[PDB]
Each structure stands twice: as structure tokens, then as C-alpha cells.
Amino acid sequence: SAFITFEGPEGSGKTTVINEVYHRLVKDYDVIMTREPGGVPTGEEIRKIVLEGNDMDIRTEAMLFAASRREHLVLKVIPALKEGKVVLCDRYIDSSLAYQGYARGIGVEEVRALNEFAINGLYPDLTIYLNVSAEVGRERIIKNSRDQNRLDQEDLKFHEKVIEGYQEIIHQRFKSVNADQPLENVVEDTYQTIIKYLEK
Amino acid sequence: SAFITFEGPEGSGKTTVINEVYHRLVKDYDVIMTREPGGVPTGEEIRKIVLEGNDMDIRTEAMLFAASRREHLVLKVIPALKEGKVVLCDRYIDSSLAYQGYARGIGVEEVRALNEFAINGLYPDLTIYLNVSAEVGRERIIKNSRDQNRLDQEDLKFHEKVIEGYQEIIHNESQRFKSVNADQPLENVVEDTYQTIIKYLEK
Numbered sequence: 001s002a003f004i005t006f007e008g009p010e011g012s013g014k015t016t017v018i019n020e021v022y023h024r025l026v027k028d029y030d031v032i033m034t035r036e037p038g039g040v041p042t043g044e045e046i047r048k049i050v051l052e053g054n055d056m057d058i059r060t061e062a063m064l065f066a067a068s069r070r071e072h073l074v075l076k077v078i079p080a081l082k083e084g085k086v087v088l089c090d091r092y093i094d095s096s097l098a099y100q101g102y103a104r105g106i107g108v109e110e111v112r113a114l115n116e117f118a119i120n121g122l123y124p125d126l127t128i129y130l131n132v133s134a135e136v137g138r139e140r141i142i143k144n145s146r147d148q149n150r151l152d153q154e155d156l157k158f159h160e161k162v163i164e165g166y167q168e169i170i171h172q173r174f175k176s177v178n179a180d181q182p183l184e185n186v187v188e189d190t191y192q193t194i195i196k197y198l199e200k
Numbered sequence: 201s202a203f204i205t206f207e208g209p210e211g212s213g214k215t216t217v218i219n220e221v222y223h224r225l226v227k228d229y230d231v232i233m234t235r236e237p238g239g240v241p242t243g244e245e246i247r248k249i250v251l252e253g254n255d256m257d258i259r260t261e262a263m264l265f266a267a268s269r270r271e272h273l274v275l276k277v278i279p280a281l282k283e284g285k286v287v288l289c290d291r292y293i294d295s296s297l298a299y300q301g302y303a304r305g306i307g308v309e310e311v312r313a314l315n316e317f318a319i320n321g322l323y324p325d326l327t328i329y330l331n332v333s334a335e336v337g338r339e340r341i342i343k344n345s346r347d348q349n350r351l352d353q354e355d356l357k358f359h360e361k362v363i364e365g366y367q368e369i370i371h372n373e374s375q376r377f378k379s380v381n382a383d384q385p386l387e388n389v390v391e392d393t394y395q396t397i398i399k400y401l402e403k
């Protein structure tokens with residue numbers, strides 16, 4: 001069994017990559033694809049509070065994300081891994097450090113301690129970092145947007161802090177894949193990295 | 201303004217103590233009495249998930265409790281303090297250590313960091329710890345119970361770990377902590393608590 005997470009900022013193709021990588025592995029492996037909270041009722045109830053939250057305080061969010069992370073972890077991921085399944089998870093501890101910790105400014109270390117409490121030791125066996133540059137990331141975002149408009153300065157500034165944040169969290173479970181490439185190549189490299197790990 | 205927390209396990213008179221102390225201060229000071237989540241919507245939505253949680257994971261509880269703690273803190277306590285009020289709060293950070301940290305066995309340091317994350321530096325100015333022995337706590341607990349039955353061995357064992365947990369948190373060299381002997385009749389516990397706060401509030 002294997003617990004694989006997918007990390008990257010918007011504009012990195014993560015949704016497409018994970019979705020396509022899942023179809024290619026479903027043939028050979030007993031695999032599942034999930035995204036926090038993953039249908040977990042308590043998990044959803046908790047994440048529904050941040051979505052309906054206005055001007056909600058960032059530490060409060062950091063914590064609700066940590067709780068949702070744990071429910072999804074104890075009620076769905078662990079059980080799947082105890083039955084020998086390969087789990088492909090969209091976002092996990094590293095999104096929080098990059099987003100909440102770094103982009104939002106709370107502090108990586110605090111947020112790291114918070115999440116360490118939530119996962120109680122269970123780290124991914126492999127984490128695919130979809131490394132995209134702010135400019136590429138920017139252009140995929142616009143490409144995929146409703147009216148194809150330019151982004152608000154707030155957003156560009158943030159996306160950049162996200163990416164910068166990820167660049168710090170990378171410095172063995174991490175495998176960096178070049179997301180500046182067309183998606184099919186990103187998918188191919190991702191698939192290859194996963195197959196290679198699974199072989200071993 | 202002043203931020204004063206009340207801490208004690210079951211059987212220590214805390215609910216009675218706090219209410220009675222609130223009325224005595226109401227005359228002289230501009231004071232409010234709250235209990236997390238204290239009516240704060242987001243706080244209540246958060247705490248309701250635990251209450252409706254069966255077999256819910258102790259860490260998940262810990263974090264929802266901390267979340268609810270911070271909403272209450274930022275949306276109700278800080279605003280009140282900012283208007284020069286005395287805020288009496290029933291339970292806070294030290295309950296979590298005792299209950300979650302120690303009694304539930306998660307680990308005091310981890311739960312302490314979880315709380316350090318939640319309160320972001322806002323500690324109570326004064327923390328009144330109602331110090332009752334397990335045995336007295338036990339009899340108060342049974343007195344107050346629906347049918348006055350003897351407690352299950354799970355509960356006695358748990359009430360005792362809580363206390364033990366609270367004994368450890370006191371030997372903080374911390375001065376925010378004042379211990380009141382909750383083994384006395386409630387009226388003396390009320391009086392000593394009242395006296396402590398007044399004294400604090402005079403300075």
C-alpha cells in the first residue's frame with residue numbers, strides 16, 4: 001500500500017494530473033483518489049464552516065483545516081491503507097505550510113506544529129510537487145478562468161507567495177516534477193515517478 | 201480591564217462559585233461572565249460537531265475545542281477587554297491540558313502547543329484554580345447527580361487523572377495562578393475567590 005499526496009499551487013495542473021494519473025494506475029493497482037475532506041461527514045461539516053465564513057480569522061481556519069485533515073485521515077485514508085490500497089491524495093500537510101504558514105503569514109513552524117498534531121506521525125510515502133513558475137501558473141489560471149481576464153493584483157501577489165512558500169518546504173518523500181511543461185508531459189513524468197516508487 | 205479564568209475539575213464548585221462571584225462584582229465593576237463558546241455563532245457551530253460526535257477522535261476534539269476557543273476569544277473576549285471590562289471566563293487553556301493533555305493521554309506538551317497556537321499570546325491576567333481533592337470532588341459530583349448513584353470506576357479513575365493533571369499545571373511558577381481550597385464549604389470557597397479577585401482588582 002502507499003500514501004501519495006499531490007502538492008502544488010494553482011496553475012500547476014494538479015487536478016488534471018491527479019485525475020489522469022489515477023486512470024492510468026487503476027488498471028494495475030488497487031487505488032483510490034481522494035481530496036480533503038473526501039466525503040467524510042464530520043470532515044465536511046468542519047470545512048463547511050470555513051467556506052461559509054466571512055472575515056474568519058486565519059488561525060481559526062488553520063485549525064479547522066487541521067481538524068478536517070485528521071477526520072479524513074482517520075476515517076478514510078488510514079482504513080484504505082490498512083487494506084493495501086494505493087491512495088492518491090490531493091493536498092495534505094504541505095499545502096497548509098505553504099498557504100497558511102507562509103502565504104498568509106502565520107508562520108511555517110507554528111503551522112507545522114499544528115499539522116504535526118493533526119497527522120500524529122503519518123506522513124506520505126511519496127509527495128509529488130508540481131513545480132510551476134508564477135508566470136506559467138498565472139497563464140493556466142487565466143486560461144481556465146470564466147472570462148479569461150487578468151488577475152487582481154491581490155491574487156498575483158498571493159500566488160507568488162504560495163510558490164515561494166513551496167520552494168522553502170522542498171529543501172526524500174519529495175519528488176519535484178516540472179509543471180512548466182505541457183500537462184501531458186507533466187502527467188507522464190508524474191506517472192513515471194509513482195510507478196518507479198511502487199516497483200520498489 | 202481584566203481577563204480572569206476559572207479552572208477546576210468536576211466537584212470543585214466552579215459553576216456555583218463563578219456565578220456567585222459574578223453577582224458580587226456586578227455591583228462595583230463593569231463585568232461579564234462567559235463560558236466558551238459563549239454564544240459566538242462560529243464557536244457554537246464548532247462545538248456542536250463534537251457534542252454530536254460519537255467515537256470522535258480525541259485529537260480532532262482537541263482542535264475543534266481550540267477553534268471554538270479562538271472564535272470566542274477574538275469575537276467576544278478581546279472586544280470586551282478593549283472596552284475596559286472584567287471578563288470572567290469558565291474554563292480555558294488549563295482545562296484542555298488537564299482534560300485533553302493529561303486525562304485523555306494525548307500529551308501535555310502537544311496540547312499546550314495546540315493552545316499556544318489558538319490563544320496567540322492572550323493569557324489570563326488571573327487564573328483561579330479551585331483545588332478540591334478527588335474524594336470531596338467525588339461526593340459533590342454524586343450529590344449533584346440525577347439519582348445520587350455511586351460513580352462508575354471509569355469516572356473515578358478519570359476524575360482523578362484530571363486532578364492529577366491540574367496539580368501538574370499549577371507548579372507553573374506562574375502568578376496568574378491562585379489556588380483556592382475547594383475542599384471547604386462552597387461559601388468559603390466563594391469568599392476566598394471573591395477576596396482574591398478584589399485584591400487583584402485593587403492593584
Ligand SMILES: Cc1cn([C@H]2C[C@H](O)[C@@H](COP(=O)(O)O)O2)c(=O)[nH]c1=O
Pocket residue numbers: 035036065090091092095096097099100
Ligand atoms: C489543503 C489546503 C488548501 N488550501 C486552499 C487552496 C485552494 O484555494 C483551496 C483548496 O484547494 P484545491 O481545491 O485546489 O484542492 O484552499 C489552503 O489554503 N490550505 C490548505 O491546507
